[PDB]
A paper describes a structure:
Far-red light photoacclimation, or [name], is a facultative response exhibited by some cyanobacteria that allows them to absorb and utilize lower energy light (700–800 nm) than the wavelengths typically used for oxygenic photosynthesis (400–700 nm). To address these issues, we have isolated a FRL-absorbing PBP complex from cells of the marine cyanobacterium Synechococcus 7335 grown in FRL and solved its structure to a global resolution of 2.78 Å by single-particle, cryo-EM.
The [name]-AP core structure was solved to a global resolution of 2.78 Å based on the map-to-map Fourier Shell Correlation, although some map regions were challenging to model due to preferential orientation (see Experimental procedures). Nineteen subunits were identified: eight [name] (β-type subunit), six [name] (α-type subunit), one [name] (α-type subunit with two REP domains (Pfam00427)), one [name] (α-type subunit), one [name] (α-type subunit), one [name] (β-type subunit), and one [name] (core linker). Other than the [name] subunit, which is a core linker protein that assembles into the opening of a trimeric AP toroid, the subunits are arranged as (αβ) heterodimers that further assemble into three (αβ)3 toroids. Trimer 1 and trimer 2 are closely associated, forming a face-to-face hexamer, and trimer 3 is more separated in a tail-to-tail assembly with the trimer 1-trimer 2 toroid. One anion was identified and tentatively modeled as chloride, and each subunit except [name] binds a single phycocyanobilin chromophore. As previously suggested, these chromophores should contribute the most red-shifted absorbance due to the absence of a thioether bond from a Cys sidechain to the vinylidene moiety on pyrrole ring A, which therefore extends the conjugation system in the chromophore. The chromophores of [name] and [name] therefore likely serve as the terminal emitters in the core complex, linking the other phycocyanobilins in the [name]-AP core complex to the Chl molecules in FRL-PSII.
Residue numbers in the entry:
A (entry chain I): 2 to 159
B (entry chain D), H (entry chain H): 1 to 161
C (entry chain S): 1 to 67
D (entry chain J): 2 to 168
E (entry chain K): 3 to 71, 149 to 515, 539 to 695
F (entry chain C): 2 to 165
G (entry chain R): 2 to 161
Write the structure that this text describes.
């Protein structure tokens, strides 16, 4: 969130929250309800987002552990899609990527290397998830949500 | 560093003068470019690795700078060049989003030329590849925001020449 | 190991040194290769004008044996 | 962690999505945010007055601290105590902006009792002065026009509760 | 409620005398005081006659001095409290002048007076300086001003007036180095009271002895002690590159860090985390501020070794901000900068010269366990928890390898213990009971193996109690009490033991379970401290828990343990915590479809 | 500025600016026209505030180096106060308090104690300017610029705000 | 400590009497107390039913109850059910006292270490505890449940 | 760190004499095991990433330790567990190549129990993971070298115990 880091910045160069930072968090508090309503829409659409995104991911990437004949790998992948959607809704609710960075970006590359799951394939799945979510959301709702998808993708795009 | 707002404030403050109408309209232009500058910065943040991959593919691969005796031979040097490119792209993102290229002047171009001449890193291939990166971001961002980040890619190219 | 001979002057912009915290800023310093990238970034972060970077030790284009 | 990030982290650690209770709590915090920013502004404008006058009131009610036996007798210790007052006021204002005591948890209560026992600093005048700060910010918030003084009540009470002993 | 980082003994310096400053300088240079420091001490002790008699005459005439002490204020308009504080301040200033005269240093005046311009309401500062000038005039009026020490009294009063005329001096700031690092502020009175620390700056044109002093201070910072006298400091190429025009103090700090001397001292005997904390001491002059700083350091060491950690510490922004290029790192403690409360205990146990005496990494344990609930621990720390073996009071020594995590439990807090009753079954725990295992002799032997976890020698047999129980004169409970009141039991569990440790181990042997909380432990410790060992034994045998569990005819047995005890009693891990995944399929070996 | 602080914080961790930083930038750019108009009101009305504040402060405190007979000290006092309001307008346009701190709070007390101006009289003069700026501009436009007046004020009341 | 005791201890450190805001918090406790006693009555009456529906809705028919699972081996299912009884009874204690000090003083100290030594799944326990919170909320109404679930979330936060 | 030769020399130096005959016999045993010691260390060095992957796959995946509220949730903590397993494997390989567990006691075991209790890391699940690692390392070197390094894995489990 912007408010935690502006607190940390005021803490570092020791002072109080100056008036410009106060207007910044005022605009954050004013934009709160819209983030809440789009979070509610994402919670309503999360399951169908996972289904359509997995279908498009297998269309755009058939050689994957999820698309193999092993359904444990497919179930783990679908669980991963749902988990990243939940974390992205967390990021939308917070207004920055702090739940996303804390839970599913920091160390996600090391995990999927330890799982041998190709991180380009996860990035493509999150691309398809982004397309499904932007299709399922309004233009301004897409404008809010798509950056968090971009930041989840870029966290594994390597 | 300086951004657009800080260079305007600095130019007025080094004169004992409030910001004037030309400065207020220049700051207005900055404010109305802010939305697409933020969107372009997010697009680059998403696609940085792809940018660097395509840039090195179309400007620096399958030439003798890659094979034996080349400067990009011996994989640690290729990785050093790729690190240089991630830094170039992120600092161009900083310059384009901040509105001023002063971040480039005080964190790239100070020291970069003498380091490259100290190491034998060819500046001309660096500049050609950096403008290929500019062309890539032109290709997949659009004409307007692509040119906006391309201005600071031009500054990186000029400051290395 | 290959060394960089670096002359730079790094100014302070966030703190007033009282009488003892003042040290110097214009340093000429032998820098190891594996740290020179981070030292260049650090003295660019603090806002230093780097005026002189040369290769003190080692040659250019070394495929091996440079460390 | 503010209220938003704390509640989000809790639901992340249990794996649930956002239910309507969370949406209501988040909207409640977002509505109270205007009052929180107003109190942060008044605090940033009158912080030196609030912290120093709370120190003065504490030394009037607890007289011994400025007396030679007390651990705020000389002006070195007096300035150290007033700087501690500014510390408490600044981090309580941070918690007022955040609405959560995580900032206090990691940056005020992270060893305060150990420091105050190492230096001989009395705990209970410290929390008495914290309460004087809280009553001061309460009364100039009420004069400023903020009917809900509930928000500004909590960080000083949290610092007092975590710092004080058990009778 | 939260775990304790330790409250170490701290002595904050309020000022400096003349001997304290000289000894501080000599100590901070690691040497005997030299001839000019000797002349400092001997000349000040020579003037001590004049200084003590000046203080004598000023204390003798203090009443008239402050009676004598711009627009003179009115008593009624000013207020009674404010008049009282005016008189108190005036007598206080005179007292501190005499304190300075005896101490031979104006550090007490300068520290306690310089930032007083606005503390005193600053509309009475003209009145304040006029009163101080009049006190100077009067103190010199009855102390003959021709060529005597009235010049000294004039100088000290002038210094007091000069300190008081100094307006608002800026508080020093330890700015936060990262989002996780809190910024701290620091009064200049606290800065000037703090012990003077030498700032060893090495310039290329220094003389040789000054350079060698800077080298020795670099050894004392990094290697914690002077190694130059030893032949282990044979680092002739790093020293030689450092002395002349190149290889500055930062590169030399890095070369000291990556040397095998530093590895032998602070990396070879330590795990990675303790090594990281010691490196933080030896290269930045401070401990770990926060957990996230430690995450950065630990991840970096995990993928790149400890030498890269040294490279990152000496290549950091904080290093160049404090120690720059050619300043030796110095320890940043109490009065040097503003201290955080976050790492107070670990960092004051780290700045102490006995920091290598601790192996368990103090910073990470405190920082992590503050963000965790209360641990399973005896209420008076973990040293009071003995080792759950058959016999032997084995407690962690507070001095030998201190692995101490202090924790404050409430009086009503209760320990969670793993009972053997719910675990296992019946006819599995009724094999270890030994009531009335029907032979008397076996019950004597089992009562021994409870009271002393192994069978004892003949000299430790309480044969009179054997005859009493074989005759039916006393029951099993009285026999266990007599065994626990035997001399050899006292030697085994009471004499060579800390008293609460002794009470806890006697409780474990006589009740078969650790204590729960400060209720039980407080009562037993109070009993054994106001009444003694046999009183505690009688109170534990006549405890209601003994009667409910072991009754009168049943030998005590172990019933509950700490969870650490079972973790010891399962070195292969617990039995079935989650179903295993024998013959699994992983990606890569599956993908080669 | 806001973009300056975001770029510095992002380059510290060697990372691209997050979506929340860009939301902060876009919100500030949305309010940019409003803050420019705030600065416009400040530009128009600054000399009146300076002259009324200097008259009021001279009346409330005659023992003042500007109030001493020299014209250059007087001109320097008005120059300093107009410079401070200039930095407040800079703070309005940048979006944070960087151009007050960096261009005149950091090292200000020691600057004036080297100059010889008493800082309590400076505090009173700034209090006077704050009063006439409150009474002069408007109500809503005071809420944007008077907090920065409080920020420059709060740096010099701290030898200790006086009680009994 | 209970709510009254925390109020008294905050005042007694200052050495003064309870102030007006603390008196208002005393009013809040002294007009929540009726529904606290009623919720404690109903929870004491239906503790076994709450624990049964808790285990059914969260812990059953997953491999934690199967062979190899932590809740196999009937004595371990008994220990899990007993921990659930302890959690519900101590949540009732926290709700009646108004403070989570009884949770931190008798439940949460060393429970993470005990469970992790024994290998008890922490996340499954937090899941079952929130499920029990759902059971209490559903069969006591949102009106009552908004209090008891606060202490259940205290147990969940301390466990995690 | 005291390896087998070093601790042997230390026993004889404390006794003050030369290495006695039985000590030379044990040194002969070490000197003829050293070749298979080097080969086992060679294979561990090659396949360390695979060993940790299959070990976590057989002991730490698909349990509630990886679900929400489990300790291996929140990807950074999964990576922390991976790097802890890497530390365990590399330091056990050091102990096997050295012929004594002093490097395990000094670099790993001396306060890891305190740190894991402080962080709330599962001690029992780490012990199960180390035994699973012993099984995995046992599987692709064979019985002799497998038990020779599983002694050090069991030592890690005993020091966590
Ligand atoms: C009035 C408040 C009481 C009082 C105070 C007092 N404190 C100290 C010294 C220190 N105070 C702190 C405090 C903090 N550091 C932090 O990081 C935090 C959170 C931001 C806090 C609250 C510290 C660390 C110190 C040590 C010195 C330092 O400045 O770093 C003193 C001086 C101690 C001495 O004798 O030297 C005093 C006087 N004293 C009273 O009597 C009041 C009850
Ligand atoms: C799906 C988009 C891709 C894919 C996935 C895949 N994942 C696994 C296994 C795991 N994935 C995770 C995930 C997370 N841990 C976290 O903490 C978070 C962030 C909050 C996430 C998203 C975990 C923990 C596992 C381990 C198994 C478990 O749940 O315990 C697998 C299985 C690998 C295996 O060998 O079992 C797979 C296949 N597969 C694809 O094809 C997509 C690219
Ligand atoms: C073959 C085993 C795998 C594979 C090969 C592959 N490589 C490339 C492209 C390049 N490979 C290199 C390699 C090196 N440069 C060095 O300095 C060193 C050390 C001496 C090495 C190994 C380079 C520089 C390139 C870039 C192209 C160039 O040489 O100019 C490709 C082409 C990829 C593309 O799409 O362009 C390929 C296919 N591919 C596999 O699947 C194998 C696992
Ligand atoms: C890539 C486009 C070209 C290339 C690169 C290359 N660079 C190096 C070595 C260094 N490059 C730098 C870079 C920077 N310094 C700065 O301050 C900035 C920040 C904006 C940058 C980008 C530095 C510091 C080094 C030396 C230290 C280090 O390598 O970490 C090499 C290696 C040279 C060698 O001898 O090993 C290479 C190969 N080479 C090409 O051919 C491209 C045209
Ligand atoms: C004999 C081969 C070696 C030796 C032994 C020695 N031991 C002690 C003292 C104790 N030994 C123990 C041991 C245990 N307690 C248990 O519960 C078990 C099984 C888990 C064992 C093995 C204990 C607890 C003690 C202390 C109490 C007691 O003595 O009963 C000593 C005495 C040392 C002292 O100072 O008391 C000695 C000498 N010494 C050698 O040199 C041999 C290598
Ligand atoms: C059949 C003879 C009687 C009966 C059975 C019944 N059982 C269940 C559910 C469970 N029973 C168990 C059993 C065990 N767990 C253990 O650890 C042991 C030791 C090996 C045993 C015997 C378990 C685990 C379950 C839950 C299912 C699971 O594995 O998760 C039910 C269903 C109850 C419900 O509400 O679903 C039933 C019906 N019912 C009768 O009427 C017979 C007398
Ligand atoms: C059930 C929801 C989960 C579960 C439980 C489980 N627990 C144990 C064993 C113990 N649990 C405790 C805990 C407490 N004792 C107390 O007095 C208190 C009240 C404040 C608590 C919380 C203790 C001490 C034990 C050991 C004694 C006993 O036998 O119960 C087990 C047994 C594990 C084993 O036998 O190895 C189990 C199964 N397990 C799950 O999988 C559920 C998620
Ligand atoms: C993996 C098998 C299990 C697990 C691991 C886990 N560990 C941490 C965190 C840390 N682990 C350590 C360990 C060490 N310090 C040393 O010096 C050595 C080297 C020999 C070791 C092994 C430390 C110090 C930490 C803290 C720093 C860090 O986080 O990297 C975590 C994260 C804890 C947290 O709260 O972030 C985890 C998850 N967890 C399991 O569930 C596995 C059974
Ligand atoms: C050098 C010894 C020393 C002194 C004299 C000192 C000053 C001091 N006096 C102080 C204060 C005052 N001194 C004075 C008075 C005077 N102080 C003087 O020396 C004279 C001549 C005057 C003007 C009449 C007043 C009115 C106060 C107000 C205190 C308040 O604000 O409540 C204080 C604050 C603590 C307290 O109230 O006790 C301090 C710290 N502190 C020191 O360390
Ligand atoms: Cl003298």
């Amino acid at each position: 969130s912007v408010i935690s880091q502006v607190i940390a910045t005021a803490d570092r160069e020791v002072r109080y929250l100056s008036k410009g930072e106060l207007d910044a968090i005022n605009r954050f508090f004013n934009n709160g309800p819209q983030r809440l309503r789009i979070v509610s829409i994402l919670n309503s659409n999360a399951e169908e987002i996972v289904e359509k995104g997995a279908r498009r991911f297998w269309q755009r990437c058939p050689i994957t552990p999820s698309n193999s004949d092993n359904q444990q790998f497919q179930a783990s992948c679908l669980r991963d899609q749902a988990w990243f959607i939940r974390l992205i809704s967390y990021a939308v609710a917070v207004g920055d990527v702090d739940p996303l960075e804390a839970s599913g970006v920091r160390g996600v590359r090391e995990m999927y290397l330890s799982l041998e799951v190709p991180l380009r394939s996860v990035a493509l799945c999150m691309r398809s998830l982004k397309e499904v979510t932007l299709a399922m959301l309004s233009r301004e709702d897409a404008a809010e949500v798509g950056p968090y998808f971009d930041y989840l993708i870029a966290g594994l795009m390597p | 560093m300086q951004d657009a707002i800080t260079t305007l404030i600095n130019t007025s403050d080094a004169q004992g003068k409030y910001l004037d109408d030309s400065s207020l309209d220049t700051l207005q232009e900055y404010f109305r470019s802010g939305d697409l500058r933020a969107k372009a910065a997010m697009t680059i943040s998403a696609n940085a690795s792809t940018i660097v991959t395509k840039t090195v593919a179309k400007s620096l691969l399958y030439t003798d700078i890659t094979g034996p005796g080349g400067n990009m031979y011996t994989c640690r040097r290729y990785a050093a060049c790729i690190r240089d490119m991630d830094f170039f792209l992120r600092y161009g993102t900083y310059a384009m989003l901040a509105g001023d290229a002063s971040i480039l002047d005080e964190r790239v171009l100070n020291g970069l030329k003498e380091t490259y001449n100290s190491l034998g890193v060819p500046v001309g291939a660096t500049i050609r590849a950096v403008q290929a990166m500019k062309e890539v971001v032109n290709d997949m961002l659009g004409a307007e925001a692509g040119k906006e980040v391309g201005y600071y890619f031009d500054h990186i190219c000029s400051g290395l020449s | 190991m290959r060394m960089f001979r670096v002359t730079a002057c790094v100014p302070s912009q966030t703190r007033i040194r009282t009488q003892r915290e003042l040290q110097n800023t214009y340093f000429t310093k032998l820098v190891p290769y594996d740290n020179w990238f981070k030292e260049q970034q650090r003295i660019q972060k603090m806002g230093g004008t780097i005026v002189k970077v040369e290769l003190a030790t080692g040659r250019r284009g070394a495929n091996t044996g440079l460390a | 962690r503010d209220t938003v990030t704390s509640l989000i982290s809790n639901y992340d650690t249990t794996g649930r999505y956002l239910d309507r209770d969370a949406i209501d709590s988040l909207q409640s915090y977002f509505i109270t945010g205007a009052n929180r920013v107003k109190v942060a502004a008044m605090i940033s404008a009158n912080a030196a007055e609030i912290s120093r006058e709370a120190g003065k009131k504490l030394f009037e009610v607890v007289p011994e601290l400025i007396r030679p036996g007390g651990n705020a007798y000389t002006t070195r210790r007096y300035a150290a105590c007033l700087r501690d007052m500014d510390y408490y006021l600044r981090y309580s204002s941070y918690a007022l902006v955040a609405g959560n005591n995580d900032v206090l948890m990691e940056r005020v209560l992270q060893g305060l009792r150990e420091t105050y026992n190492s230096l001989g600093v009395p705990i209970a005048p410290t929390v008495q002065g914290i309460q004087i700060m809280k009553e001061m910010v309460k009364e100039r918030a009420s004069d400023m026009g903020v009917d809900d003084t509930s928000f500004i009540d909590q960080p000083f009470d949290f610092i007092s509760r975590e710092v004080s002993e058990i009778s | 409620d939260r775990t304790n980082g330790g409250s170490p003994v701290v002595h904050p310096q309020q000022y400096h005398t003349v001997p304290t400053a000289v000894i501080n300088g000599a100590h901070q240079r690691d040497r005997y005081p030299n001839h000019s420091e000797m002349q400092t001490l001997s000349t000040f002790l020579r003037t001590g006659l004049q200084r003590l008699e000046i203080a004598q005459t000023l204390a003798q005439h203090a009443n008239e001095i402050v009676a004598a002490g711009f627009q003179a204020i009115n008593i009624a308009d000013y207020g009674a409290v404010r008049m009282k504080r005016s008189m108190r301040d005036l007598g206080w200033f005179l007292r501190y002048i005499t304190y300075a005269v005896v101490a031979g240093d104006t550090s007490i005046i300068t520290v306690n007076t310089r930032g007083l311009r606005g503390i005193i309401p600053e509309d009475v500062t003209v009145a304040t300086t006029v009163a101080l000038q009049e006190m100077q005039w009067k103190s010199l009026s009855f102390f003959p001003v021709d060529s005597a020490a009235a010049a000294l009294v004039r100088r000290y009063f002038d210094v007091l007036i000069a300190d008081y005329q100094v307006e608002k001096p800026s508080d020093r700031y330890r700015t936060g180095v990262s989002k996780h690092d809190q910024g701290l502020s620091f009064p200049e009175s606290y800065e000037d009271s703090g012990c003077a620390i030498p700032r060893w700056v090495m310039k290329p044109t220094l003389p040789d002895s000054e350079k060698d002093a800077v080298i020795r201070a670099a050894y004392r910072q990094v290697f914690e002690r002077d190694i130059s006298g030893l032949g282990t400091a044979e680092l002739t190429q790093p020293i030689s590159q450092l002395k002349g025009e190149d290889g500055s103090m930062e590169l030399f700090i890095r070369q000291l860090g990556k040397s095998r001397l530093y590895r032998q001292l602070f990396y070879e005997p330590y795990m990675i985390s303790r090594s990281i904390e010691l490196a933080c001491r030896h290269f930045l002059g401070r401990g770990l501020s926060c957990m996230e700083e430690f995450q950065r350091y630990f991840e970096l060491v995990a993928d790149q070794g400890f030498s890269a950690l040294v490279d990152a510490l000496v290549s950091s922004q904080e290093y160049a901000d404090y120690f720059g290029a050619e300043t030796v790192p110095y320890i940043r403690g109490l009065g040097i900068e503003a201290q955080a409360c976050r790492n107070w205990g670990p960092q004051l146990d780290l700045f102490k010269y006995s920091a290598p005496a601790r192996k368990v990494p103090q910073f990470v344990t405190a920082f992590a366990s503050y963000r965790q609930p209360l641990p399973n621990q005896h209420p008076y720390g973990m040293g009071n928890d003995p080792l759950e073996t058959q016999f032997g009071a084995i407690f962690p020594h507070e001095t030998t390898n201190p692995a101490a995590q202090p924790v404050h439990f409430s009086e009503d807090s209760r320990r969670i213990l793993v009972g053997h009753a719910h675990r296992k079954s019946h006819a599995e725990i009724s094999q270890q009971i030994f009531s009335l295992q029907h032979s008397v002799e076996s019950v004597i032997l089992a009562a021994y193996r409870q009271v002393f976890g192994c069978e004892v020698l003949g000299s430790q047999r309480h044969q009179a109690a054997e005859t009493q129980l074989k005759g039916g004169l006393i029951t099993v409970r009285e026999f266990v009490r007599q065994l626990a009141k035997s001399r050899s039991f006292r030697q085994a569990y009471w004499e060579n033991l800390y008293m609460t440790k002794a009470a806890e181990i006697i409780h474990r042997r006589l009740l078969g379970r650790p204590t729960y909380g400060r209720r039980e432990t407080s009562k037993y410790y109070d009993i054994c401290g106001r009444q003694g060992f046999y009183a505690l034994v009688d109170a534990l045998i006549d405890s209601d828990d003994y009667r409910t569990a072991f009754g009168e005819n049943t030998v005590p047995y172990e019933r509950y343990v700490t969870p650490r005890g079972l973790a010891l009693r399962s070195p292969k891990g617990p039995v079935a915590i989650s179903k295993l995944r024998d013959n699994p399929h992983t990606v890569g070996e599956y993908m080669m479809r | 500025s806001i973009v300056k602080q975001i770029i510095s914080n992002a380059d510290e961790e060697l990372r691209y600016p997050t979506p929340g930083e860009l939301e902060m930038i876009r919100s500030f750019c949305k309010t940019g026209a409003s803050q420019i108009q705030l600065a416009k009101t400040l530009e128009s009305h600054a000399p009146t505030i300076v002259e009324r504040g200097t008259r009021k402060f001279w009346q409330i405190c005659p023992r003042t180096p500007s109030n001493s007979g020299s014209p250059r000290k007087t001109e320097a006092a008005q120059r300093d106060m107009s410079w401070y309001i200039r930095l407040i307008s800079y703070c309005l346009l940048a979006g944070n308090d960087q151009p007050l701190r960096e261009i005149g709070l950091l090292g200000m007390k020691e600057l004036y104690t080297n100059i010889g101006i008493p800082l309590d009289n400076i505090l009173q003069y700034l209090r006077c300017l704050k009063a006439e700026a409150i009474a002069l501009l408007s109500e809503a436009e005071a809420e944007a610029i008077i907090p920065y007046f409080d920020q420059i004020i709060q740096e010099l009341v701290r030898p200790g705000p006086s009680y009994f």
